[PDB]
Write an enzyme that holds these catalytic residues in place. Sequence first.
Site, mmCIF file in Angstrom:
data_model
loop_
_atom_site.group_PDB
_atom_site.id
_atom_site.type_symbol
_atom_site.label_atom_id
_atom_site.label_comp_id
_atom_site.label_asym_id
_atom_site.label_seq_id
_atom_site.Cartn_x
_atom_site.Cartn_y
_atom_site.Cartn_z
ATOM 1 N N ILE A 120 0.801 -1.221 0.000
ATOM 2 C CA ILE A 120 0.000 0.000 0.000
ATOM 3 C C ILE A 120 0.847 1.291 0.000
ATOM 4 C CG2 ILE A 120 -2.041 -1.157 0.993
ATOM 5 C CD1 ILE A 120 -1.288 -0.202 3.710
ATOM 6 N N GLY A 121 2.146 1.183 0.305
ATOM 7 C CA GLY A 121 3.121 2.292 0.170
ATOM 8 C C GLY A 121 4.583 1.864 -0.030
ATOM 9 N N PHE A 144 12.939 3.601 3.030
ATOM 10 C CA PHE A 144 13.818 2.580 3.616
ATOM 11 C C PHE A 144 13.184 1.159 3.668
ATOM 12 N N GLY A 145 12.031 0.998 3.016
ATOM 13 C CA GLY A 145 11.348 -0.290 2.928
ATOM 14 C C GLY A 145 9.966 -0.120 2.312
ATOM 15 N N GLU A 146 9.039 -1.004 2.654
ATOM 16 C CA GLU A 146 7.674 -0.872 2.165
ATOM 17 C C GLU A 146 6.639 -0.983 3.267
ATOM 18 O OE1 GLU A 146 8.269 -5.324 0.159
ATOM 19 O OE2 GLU A 146 6.774 -3.924 -0.679
ATOM 20 N N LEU A 147 5.488 -0.371 3.023
ATOM 21 C CA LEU A 147 4.327 -0.519 3.865
ATOM 22 C C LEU A 147 3.342 -1.493 3.214
ATOM 23 C CD1 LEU A 147 3.042 0.688 6.565
ATOM 24 C CD2 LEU A 147 1.863 2.201 4.952
ATOM 25 N N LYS A 198 5.033 -2.148 8.357
ATOM 26 C CA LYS A 198 6.160 -1.448 7.795
ATOM 27 C C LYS A 198 7.259 -2.492 7.777
ATOM 28 C CE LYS A 198 8.264 2.997 8.063
ATOM 29 N NZ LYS A 198 8.476 4.246 8.795
ATOM 30 N N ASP A 231 10.987 15.559 11.010
ATOM 31 C CA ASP A 231 10.480 15.093 9.732
ATOM 32 C C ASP A 231 9.069 15.591 9.428
ATOM 33 O OD1 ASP A 231 10.849 13.847 7.320
ATOM 34 O OD2 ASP A 231 10.368 11.822 8.050
#
Length: 296
Positions: free
Chosen positions: A13-14, A16-19, A34, A124
């Site tokens: 769905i998204g 430094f990695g994926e969601l 995550k 951030d």
Amino acid sequence: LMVGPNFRVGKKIGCFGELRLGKNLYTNEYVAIKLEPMKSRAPQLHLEYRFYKQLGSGDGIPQVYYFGPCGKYNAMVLELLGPSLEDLFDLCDRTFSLKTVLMIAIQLISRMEYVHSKNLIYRDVKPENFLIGRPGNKTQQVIHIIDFALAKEYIDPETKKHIPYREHKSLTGTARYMSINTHLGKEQSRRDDLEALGHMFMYFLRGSLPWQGLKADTLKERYQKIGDTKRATPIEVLCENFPEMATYLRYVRRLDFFEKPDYDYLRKLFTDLFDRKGYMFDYEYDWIGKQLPTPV
Ligand SMILES: [Cl-]
Ligand SMILES: [Cl-]
């Protein structure tokens, strides 16, 4: 396939990695997963989890459920949220009413106050990191702060002292909302979270910021150009038509490095505005009655 005992990993769905979309099988509840490759040469997932734990249960803080191995990834399982303010910003034709922005600002100053109360600075700030709850949940109205990968403990645990001032801090994050002092390589403190918020509030009100198109041949030089344009843009011009926004930005820009911001004052700048304009805090944001995307 699975994270810990009970969390099933679902579609991307998204990114430094994926969601991933996840489901708690044991409760029949969707979750966010995550992921981070274990071969990451610069891991952030575990430190982010550690910051989440440090934050604990707060208004607008995503619940965190598990951190563990997931095949050849490390996984963090947390509460599934809805669209970000940026996604929503796009659905609202890249401007927000003053009421939306004020309702956002009041909330996110309190969100930031809370983060700071847990001895963390956030570092951030960006619309993409502020997510509404899920389309039907008790929390769709709540703006949540996510992505603590770039956070820092600004009070040293042993000494209980504010982190010392320093410079020559290299630039890496989002340049568009970062404080002028972040641009100058200064150690970020509480003030910088709050200034970055102010920039983003202005981004939402104006539809854009006047340094947002700037490109350079290196990224260091681009940060410089953007920072120069920030310095060269008088708060009074950036915030024309928004007096309390200029007042907010001057205040946060003038904060000492170590100074605890007066959150109450800033919130009251905006709640007085809000009142005076005749607004009701009814969570009726600009995107209400739009087709909002879903994770599930
Ligand atoms: Cl099932
Ligand atoms: Cl940027």
